[PDB]
Curated annotation (Swiss-Prot), chain H:
GO terms for molecular function: 4 iron, 4 sulfur cluster binding; electron transfer activity; metal ion binding; oxidoreductase activity. [4Fe-4S] cluster 2 binds at residues 20, 47, 50, 53. [4Fe-4S] cluster 1 binds at residues 10, 13, 16, 57. It comes from Pisum sativum. Keywords: 4Fe-4S, Chloroplast, Electron transport, Iron, Iron-sulfur, Membrane, Metal-binding, Oxidoreductase, Photosynthesis, Photosystem I, Plastid, Repeat, Thylakoid, Transport. It comes from the Eukaryota. GO terms for biological process: photosynthetic electron transport in photosystem I. This is Photosystem I iron-sulfur center. The keyword NAD does not apply. Apoprotein for the two 4Fe-4S centers FA and FB of photosystem I (PSI); essential for photochemical activity. FB is the terminal electron acceptor of PSI, donating electrons to ferredoxin. The C-terminus interacts with PsaA/B/D and helps assemble the protein into the PSI complex. Required for binding of PsaD and PsaE to PSI. PSI is a plastocyanin-ferredoxin oxidoreductase, converting photonic excitation into a charge separation, which transfers an electron from the donor P700 chlorophyll pair to the spectroscopically characterized acceptors A0, A1, FX, FA and FB in turn. Its cofactor is [4Fe-4S] cluster. One of its GO terms (cellular component) is chloroplast thylakoid membrane.
Length: 42, 73, 73, 743, 73, 159, 143, 80
């Protein structure tokens, strides 16, 4: 468990998880507001 | 025209980077502090200290010629 | 078209040569003590800020120009 | 002396301690990172087991377990294939009308407007067309519904899990001992008989029961869903009796040696099936039966435990003549103590085998409705060619690694290897001369033709209408092949392939499957170009292997190791003297050779083979036979091949093939990017990184792990990797777009 | 070529070539007077750059003149 | 029994003894060629070499030349062969001038295969090489002229 | 002061089957090198030019075309087989020149009978710039 | 012949001498450090310019410097 946590935070694994989360977030934002070329709210 | 002009600016800045870096570091740097005693053009300083390929100022000019050709192209 | 391409390529070669000979001067004809604290010596002593900022400009231009081109494509 | 099962219990206990420590294998790496270079090293030596330790037993155990892991990966890949075919494919629609529907087994979710890639492939389906040729394999196997594909996918997943567990269990619970790995006689006996022979017998048994009756029903025109299930043909035997009467007697012909009675489904026809455009399945079943017999016999050669058999040492040491001293004496000990020797031999053989597979597979198509699926044919040929070339280059890499590391005349001395090392200079000099001579006469003729055409002197050109260079030998050989059936091979009705001759063009669904391929002056020139490129790459690789240990330049090159940048700027400069650098150059030359080979194949097929048949029998070829007259000059290759056929890919924007154009441009980019690494040296980059690091130090944001520039060898490796990726990917996109739009 | 392949390979190749020439009948009667050697590192870089530039210029000049003159418009 | 041996039994000289390198018939044939007739006047050896080479060169120029189809194929090819012989004579003369001096002895080896003395071949001197190259030029022009005369000037059915 | 050993012909040479990496014309017209060692017992070693050779019992003499080859062979003889060696340079005139170990003790161990050559009594960073030695035949490091 | 220089920062570690592949360097008596040793270059005519000695020097900057100079048949490492 402790060693699993340690290995699960090593550079490659942490980076892949971070970028998967970022990709999912951006994908969902684009899905809800697609084809957005300007900021119209204000 | 906007996009291509910015490509032109990129080319100018990178060629100037290569040439300015080659000039200002000609007299020596941290990797080869005594470069001034080895002349303008020389192959390298051997594979020691991690490897010193293309460490001369002549080699900086050499790498800048490619970027000049690309930018003028 | 021929004349324009002609003169632009020759101008690029001339500029690259000018920088090459600046580096050559640094190597050969530069006297650190006789140029103590003048503009040339001060250029030599903060070379790293110049090189780093020029690198930043190149990185910005390349990143964003290529990004916009690839986006449109 | 005897062959038995030997293992050791619990050599390594499964745990997570070493996961937390990056790079446990190397002591200095285990200590920690000082600079960023460390990180790269950690990956560069991940699978270099023979360097982390020196015990043969540990290396062998690691190799066995890694083999299990890779086998698990392959099984997972196959399970993914079968699942995608089962769920995200139009396999049944294609099965109902093969020539009508374009195979597809991949859809893309609609997220950022990428749904344009879900093109109209037919059969009420929208997806990405696949060129892997899986649909033809499934049709040839007798798969008719998606339930069977689902079952195969689940089974492959289970076998992937089993492979993974086997790897874990064999490395951590029961690790075979060294004498077990060194038992090569029994290994060869089992692989020849237990694996190849028995596997071929099993596949023949499947084909007799499932492939033959199912494909016969399919070709008879029965709808796929109305066909009896593959198991019924086993329960009730009259089902088989109807299609082939000889099943009525059942096995008694096989035991009374009345094998002629099995001529119904065990034939020697040859050629192609006029309906499906592939090989007769009754020929493939007989093929696999004969192969099974041959391998089951050949796997009884080497002695294991019962006296009868052959000792490989005896066979090796019994061969030697006046020209080679005591040759073959000592090779058995070399090949059973060094893994790199075996790896190099096997890599060379597998690369050659893959190349031969490509050649034979486009020669006579073995799957139904594969010949007229031009995209599939082109993609399969090109893929196998590239795989084979890479494996062959790896053969040289590992031969050089063995030469540097495991070669030792004090303890393991071989005579043939010694003589080769003693006249390497003559070998390489003559090979160099051959390379120069071939280069001048193959490419020089192209330059001559180009210059004559530019000067308006077509009468002086090396063409079919000016100065002919006819490959008389190849023409004679293929003529002898055309006349073969009924003369020299009486039992065959049709020639082995339709490329030999004899006319009998075969077409399917209005498209040309195959027809005789003519050989002319352009074929002569391109074949000599092929020979030139192969010889030059062989020169590079052989020179790297032979001069790996020492030369007249650096007499102690072995002490530096297999991989190293140089030996300084002394002696005029010793850049790229190591064997690894020779492999690095051989990669470029292999890329050149394979690119030319695939270009020749594509253009020749389009010009003289592929095309559309019409009512009167007039064949209109994709390219109107311009290869014979345009391929003899470089300008023709640049204009009539690259320029003309790039139109399909460059226009792909706005359609389902837009991804191919995107990959075309991206591959161009990556290839040009590689030149950044291939042309520069690390000194300039380190000096620049110094200024960057200073800029970071000014803001208290400098990394603790000092950022060093890439090593020299790493710079070369990155350059070659990017070069190969870019070139191969741009060719991939070009071929796929061209053949999908025009095919 | 000169930009990717480097000196050591060519030096060893030339060594074996010298052996071969010295070991053959009727041609060993002819003897070179300057010992053959591979091009220097700096010289190889310069030759590679010169080839790169000459090819660049010639191909672009051909393209530009042919395309503008082909249409004359 | 082993076929390949070190040179003269000396295993530290960069070469080997092989049937191709040193077989009775091959050794005799090579020793009986003009280049290796050490004790013969260099002019006559040059004459033989030039005759052989000039006669050799005519064929390819005549048959494969740009004017092969034209009626003047023989004349054009013979002139080209003569010109090539002239250029080869130029090359020989400059090589001899650059590689030899009047006041120096022969650079040829003075020892034979059994270790006994012998007069070094005079071909490797300045005047010896001058005589050899003059003989080669004369013989080459004569050979080109003969090959041209043998064909075209005289029918003589060949091929 | 350590009379260098004199080269002794007639000493047997190692058993070797011939190679294409041996001497060439440079040995004939310029110079070649000779290395000698003792080797207590007959054994097989790796040649610096080709394959494997066998050292004869007693003295062994081997002639090479490069000094670097002699040094590589000596290093292998010294570290692998624990053998003492010396090699010479031979000119076409018939001269022999003792080369290594120059003063009877290998160059690795300090000897009280050696003078300093090319030693600068200053740090490498205190060399004059080229401008100070311009138009003089000297180089900044030669000072 | 390449020019090899030894500078006074040398600590007499001997690592450069072990590295030279032509026996150009030596150890000589000296008194400015604990080892009473310093490197010498009495046979630079046999130097091939490999700069393998500099790769072994642990001082910063180097104490042994190789300046490539006029090339000879010995410096070019030619066996022909
Ligand atoms: C297509 C060829 C190519 C490309 C793309 C580049 C690009 C670059 N060169 Mg280079 N160069 C080239 C050829 C090329 N060069 C050749 C042939 C030579 C002759 C040897 C040189 C010699 C040279 C020198 C000497 C120098 C450069 C420098 C630079 C950088 C300048 C900074 C900049 O513009 O910001 C960025 C430009 C970009 C194009 C961005 C590239 C990264 C994009 C965003 C992709 C991101 C990755 C993406 C997520 C996909 C990842 C995939 C996954 C598998 C990892 C830049 C990255 C200078 C430098 O280092 O800058 C300080 C420098 O000094 N070049
Ligand atoms: C399932 C639990 C498990 C656990 C806890 C361990 C734990 C351990 N194993 Mg082990 N092993 C396992 C399963 C396991 N293994 C299996 C199933 C196999 C068969 C393949 C092996 C075979 C094996 C070998 C041969 C060796 C070990 C070794 C080790 C030890 C060293 C660190 C390590 O694991 O490497 C690092 C951990 C990783 C996760 C590395 C990644 C490896 C996977 C296979 C990569 C997946 C490939 C991927 C698809 C590639 C495509 C890339 C793409 C995704 C971009 C460690 C105590 C080594 C050892 O004991 O040293 C003496 C040793 O040599 N294991
Ligand atoms: C740069 C100047 C130059 C000139 C003026 C020529 C001129 C010629 N070339 Mg050449 N060529 C050149 C450069 C040149 N070339 C270069 C750089 C190359 C390398 C790419 C070639 C490659 C080349 C080839 C491969 C061939 C030619 C051929 C020819 C001839 C073809 C026309 C013909 O049939 O005439 C008349 C035809 C004749 C056979 C008469 C021969 C010419 C005279 C009579 C020979 C007398 C020579 C004289 C003794 C002087 C010796 C040379 C001396 C000045 C040192 C023509 C005389 C073709 C040819 O004719 O073959 C020889 C041919 O095959 N050229
Ligand atoms: C400098 C390069 C560059 C730039 C400036 C852009 C800019 C843009 N791209 Mg683009 N793109 C690029 C490179 C670039 N791209 C490359 C290289 C590719 C190839 C992989 C793509 C492929 C691509 C696609 C497929 C799409 C875009 C889209 C877009 C637009 C979407 C804005 C958005 O997501 O909503 C707004 C996002 C946010 C507001 C997120 C930030 C909010 C945070 C999470 C919360 C903060 C709270 C405080 C935007 C104008 C989309 C589009 O519709 O174009 C019009 C789209 O479909 N791009
Ligand atoms: C009938 C006997 C038999 C069979 C069929 C095989 C088959 C195979 N062996 Mg193997 N081997 C055998 C006997 C056999 N061996 C014996 C007696 C020895 C000792 C001398 C060895 C020692 C040996 C080594 C050292 C290696 C192999 C490897 C392999 C695989 C090669 C890669 C391949 O082609 O994948 C083909 C894939 C398939 C055919 C898929 C089905 C796989 C089935 C389930 C295999 C089951 C056979 C196995 C021997 C069953 C016994 C285990 C039992 C207790 C459950 C292959 C699956 C290599 C490997 O590890 O694989 C990557 C390898 O490194 N074998
Ligand atoms: C069954 C085939 C096989 C096997 C088992 C091996 C095994 C081995 N090889 Mg080898 N090799 C092979 C084939 C094989 N090779 C072939 C075909 C070639 C020719 C290309 C080579 C050329 C080669 C060289 C030059 C070297 C080895 C080396 C090694 C050893 C260490 C490799 C390592 O872990 O480094 C680390 C491995 C990596 C860092 C992985 C590299 C990742 C690649 C470059 C990326 C691939 C890109 C992908 C296909 C597409 C892009 C995806 C991306 C965008 C996400 C190891 C024992 C090394 C050695 O020292 O031997 C002892 C070494 O120097 N091999
Ligand atoms: C010279 C090239 C050549 C080649 C490649 C073949 C190839 C073949 N011949 Mg054939 N044959 C040839 C010359 C050739 N033949 C000549 C010159 C004659 C006399 C005119 C024959 C007469 C002949 C007959 C009568 C038959 C074949 C048959 C066959 C096929 C089965 C081979 C076989 O029986 O297994 C090997 C058999 C052995 C006994 C092993 C011995 C191998 C040899 C003798 C060594 C095979 C494709 C048989 C067939 O019909 O194919 C279906 C068959 O009936 N051939
Ligand atoms: C290797 C490629 C190659 C080849 C095979 C040819 C071949 C030919 N060219 Mg050519 N050419 C080439 C490249 C090539 N070219 C290139 C790169 C250029 C520059 C762009 C030219 C430009 C050119 C021009 C301008 C012309 C030709 C012409 C010709 C023809 C006559 C040339 C001639 O007579 O020369 C002389 C031939 C010889 C002296 C023969 C020497 C070779 C002998 C036969 C082989 C010796 C080996 C021997 C067998 C070894 C055995 C030893 C044993 C006896 C001991 C001929 C068929 C002419 C023509 O009219 O075309 C029809 C012509 O005018 N070429
Ligand atoms: C009138 C007018 C105007 C004005 C303007 C101005 C006034 C500005 C400018 C300008 C400028 C501002 C320009 C510039 C340029 C620059 C350059 C071109 C540069 C450079 C550099 C270099 C070249 C370097 C060299 C060297 C070195 C490197 C170091 C050593 C020394 C030497 C010097 C050698 C305008 C147009 C707006 C508008 C209209 C009106
Ligand atoms: C660019 C270049 C370098 C520099 C190469 C570098 C700096 C490697 C760059 C790798 C990445 C871009 C940096 C490491 C990324 C980290 C993992 C941090 C990522 C964090 C976020 C950005 C995700 C060389 O060292 C070199 C050496 C020899 C010949 C040519 C070259 C050469 O062309
Ligand atoms: C091919 C090659 C060689 C070998 C190149 C050789 C031996 C040159 C041989 C060329 C001959 C002499 C013919 C060249 C013809 C030229 C057109 C003639 C130019 C002469 C004057 C007109 C200037 C290297 O030595 C080398 C070294 C370092 C990096 C790369 C390389 C490299 O690529
Ligand atoms: S450069 Fe090489 S040969 Fe010269 S002194 Fe240094 S280590 Fe010795």
């Amino acid at each position: 468990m402790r060693d699993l946590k340690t290995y699960l935070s090593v550079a490659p694994v942490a980076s892949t998880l971070w970028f998967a989360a970022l990709a999912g977030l951006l994908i969902e934002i684009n899905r809800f507001f697609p084809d957005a070329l300007t900021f119209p709210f204000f | 025209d906007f996009l291509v002009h910015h490509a032109i600016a990129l080319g100018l800045h990178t060629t100037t980077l290569i040439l300015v870096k080659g000039a200002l570091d000609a007299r020596g740097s941290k990797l080869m502090p005594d470069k001034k005693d080895f002349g303008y053009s020389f192959p390298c300083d051997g594979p020691g200290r991690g490897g010193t390929c293309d460490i001369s100022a002549w080699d900086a000019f050499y790498l800048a010629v490619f970027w000049m050709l690309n930018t003028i192209g | 078209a021929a004349l324009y391409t002609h003169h632009q390529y020759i101008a690029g070669f001339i500029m690259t040569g000018a920088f090459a000979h600046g580096a050559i001067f640094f190597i050969r004809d530069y006297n650190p003590e006789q140029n103590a604290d003048n503009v040339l010596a001060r250029m030599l002593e903060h070379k790293e800020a110049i090189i780093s900022h020029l690198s930043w400009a190149s990185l910005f231009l390349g990143f964003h120009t290529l990004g916009l081109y690839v986006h449109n494509d | 002396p005897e062959v038995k099962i030997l293992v050791d219990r619990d050599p390594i206990k499964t745990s997570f301690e070493q996961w937390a420590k990056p790079g446990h294998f190397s002591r200095t790496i285990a200590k920690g990172p000082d600079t960023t270079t460390w990180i790269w090293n950690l990956h560069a030596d991940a699978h270099d087991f023979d360097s982390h330790t020196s015990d043969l037993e540990e290396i062998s155990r690691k190799v066995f377990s890694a083999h299990f892991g890779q086998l698990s990966i392959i099984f997972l890949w196959l399970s993914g294939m079968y699942f995608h075919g089962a769920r995200f494919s139009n396999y049944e629609a294609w099965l109902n009308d093969p020539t009508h529907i374009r195979p597809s087994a991949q859809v893309v979710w609609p997220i950022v407007g990428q749904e344009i890639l879900n093109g109209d492939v037919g059969g009420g389906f929208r997806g990405i067309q696949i060129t892997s040729g899986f649909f033809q394999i499934w049709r040839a196997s007798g798969i008719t519904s998606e339930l069977q594909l689902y079952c195969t996918a689940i089974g492959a997943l289970v076998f992937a899990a089993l492979m993974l567990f086997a790897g874990w269990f064999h490395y951590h619970k029961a690790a075979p001992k060294l004498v077990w790995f060194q038992d090569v006689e029994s290994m060869l006996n089992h692989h020849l008989a237990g694996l190849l022979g028995l596997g071929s017998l099993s596949w023949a048994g499947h084909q007799v029961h499932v492939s033959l009756p199912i494909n016969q029903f399919l070709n008879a025109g029965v709808d796929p869903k109305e066909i009896p299930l593959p198991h019924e043909f086993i329960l009730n035997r009259d089902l088989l009796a109807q299609l082939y009467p000889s099943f009525a007697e059942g096995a008694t012909p096989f035991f009374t040696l009345n094998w002629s009675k099995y001529a119904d489904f065990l034939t020697f026809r040859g050629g192609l099936d006029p309906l499906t455009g592939g090989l007769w399945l009754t020929d493939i079943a007989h093929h696999h039966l004969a192969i099974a017999i041959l391998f089951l016999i050949a796997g009884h050669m080497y002695r294991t435990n019962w006296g009868i058999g052959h000792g490989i040492k005896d066979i090796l040491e019994a061969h030697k003549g006046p020209f080679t001293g005591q040759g073959h004496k000592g090779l058995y000990e070399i090949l059973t103590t060094s893994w790199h020797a075996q790896l190099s031999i096997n890599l060379a053989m597998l690369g050659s085998l893959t190349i031969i597979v490509a050649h034979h597979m486009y020669a006579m198509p073995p799957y139904p409705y594969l010949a007229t699926d031009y995209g599939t044919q082109l993609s399969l040929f090109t893929h196998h060619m590239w795989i084979g070339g890479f494996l062959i280059v790896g053969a040289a890499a590992h031969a050089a690694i063995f030469m540097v590391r495991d070669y030792d005349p004090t303890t393991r001395y071989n005579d043939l290897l010694d003589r080769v090392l003693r006249h390497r200079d003559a070998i390489i000099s003559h090979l160099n001369w051959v390379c120069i001579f071939l280069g001048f006469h193959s490419f020089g003729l192209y330059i001559h033709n180009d210059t004559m055409s530019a000067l308006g002197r077509p009468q002086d050109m090396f063409s079919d209408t000016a100065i002919q260079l006819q490959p008389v030998f190849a023409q004679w050989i293929q003529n002898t092949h055309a006349l073969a059936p009924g003369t020299t091979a009486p039992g065959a009705t049709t020639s082995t392939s339709l490329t030999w001759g004899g006319g009998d063009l075969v077409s399917v669904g209005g498209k040309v499957a195959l027809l005789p391929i003519p050989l002319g002056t352009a074929d002569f020139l391109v074949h000599h170009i092929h020979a030139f490129t192969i010889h030059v790459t062989v020169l590079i690789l052989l020179k790297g292997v032979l001069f790996a240990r020492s030369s007249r330049l650096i007499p102690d090159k072995a002490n530096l190791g297999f991989r190293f940048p140089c030996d300084g700027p002394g002696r005029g400069g010793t850049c790229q003297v190591s064997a690894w650098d020779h492999v690095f150059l051989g990669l470029f030359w292999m890329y050149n050779a394979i690119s030319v080979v695939i270009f020749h194949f594509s253009w020749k097929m389009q010009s003289d083979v592929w095309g559309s048949i019409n009512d009167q029998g007039v064949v209109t070829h994709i390219t109107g036979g311009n290869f014979a007259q345009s391929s003899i000059t470089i300008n023709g290759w640049l204009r009539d091949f690259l320029w003309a056929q790039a139109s399909q890919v460059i226009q792909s924007y706005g359609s389902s093939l837009s991804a191919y154009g995107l990959f075309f441009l991206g591959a161009h980019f990556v290839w040009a990017f590689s030149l950044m690494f291939l042309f520069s040296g690390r000194g300039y980059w380190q000096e620049l990184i110094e200024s960057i690091v200073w800029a970071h130090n000014k803001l208290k944001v400098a990394p603790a792990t000092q950022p060093r520039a890439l090593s020299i060898v790493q710079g070369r490796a990155v350059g070659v990797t990017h070069y190969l990726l870019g070139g191969i990917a741009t060719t991939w996109a070009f071929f796929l777009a061209r053949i999908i739009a025009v095919g | 070529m000169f930009l990717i392949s480097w000196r050591g390979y060519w030096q060893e190749l030339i060594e074996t070539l010298a052996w071969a020439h010295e070991r053959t009948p009727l041609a060993n009667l002819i003897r070179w007077r300057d010992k053959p050697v591979a091009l220097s590192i700096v010289q190889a870089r310069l030759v590679g750059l010169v080839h790169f530039s000459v090819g660049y210029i010639f191909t672009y000049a051909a393209f530009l003149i042919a395309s503008t003159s082909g249409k004359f418009g | 029994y082993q076929v390949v041996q070190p040179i003269n039994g000396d295993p530290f000289i960069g070469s080997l003894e092989t049937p191709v390198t040193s077989s009775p018939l091959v050794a005799w044939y090579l020793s009986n060629l003009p280049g290796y007739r050490t004790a013969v006047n260099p002019l006559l050896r040059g004459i033989e070499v030039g005759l052989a080479h000039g006669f050799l060169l005519v064929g390819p120029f005549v048959k494969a030349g740009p004017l092969r189809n034209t009626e003047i194929a023989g004349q054009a090819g013979s002139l080209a062969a003569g010109g090539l012989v002239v250029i080869l004579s130029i090359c020989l003369t400059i090589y001899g001038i650059s590689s030899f001096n009047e006041g120096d002895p022969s650079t040829a080896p003075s020892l034979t295969l059994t270790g006994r003395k012998k007069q070094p071949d005079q071909l490797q001197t300045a005047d010896g090489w001058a005589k050899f190259t003059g003989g080669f030029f004369f013989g080459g022009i004569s050979g080109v002229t003969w090959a041209f005369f043998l064909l075209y000037v005289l029918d003589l059915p060949y091929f | 002061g350590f009379t260098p050993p004199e080269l002794d012909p007639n000493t047997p040479s190692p058993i070797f089957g011939g190679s294409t990496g041996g001497l060439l014309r440079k040995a004939q017209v310029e110079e070649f090198y000779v290395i000698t060692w003792e080797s207590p017992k007959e054994q097989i070693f790796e040649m610096p030019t080709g394959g494997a050779a066998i050292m004869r019992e007693g003295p062994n003499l081997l002639k090479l075309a490069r000094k670097e080859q002699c040094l590589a062979l000596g290093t292998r003889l010294r570290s692998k087989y624990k053998i003492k060696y010396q090699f010479y340079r031979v000119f076409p005139s018939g001269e022999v020149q003792y080369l290594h170990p120059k003063d009877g003790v290998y160059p690795e161990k300090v000897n009280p009978g050696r003078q300093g050559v090319g030693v600068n009594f200053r740090s490498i960073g205190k060399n004059v710039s080229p401008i100070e030695v311009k138009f003089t035949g000297k180089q900044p490091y030669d000072l | 012949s390449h020019s090899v220089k030894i500078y006074d920062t040398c600590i007499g570690c001997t690592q450069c001498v072990r590295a030279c592949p032509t026996d150009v360097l030596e150890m000589i008596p000296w008194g400015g450090c604990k080892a009473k040793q310093i490197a010498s270059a009495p046979r630079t005519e046999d130097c091939v310019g490999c700069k393998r000695c500099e790769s072994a020097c642990p001082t910063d900057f180097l104490s042994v410097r190789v300046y490539l100079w006029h090339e000879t048949t010995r410096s070019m490492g030619l066996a022909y």
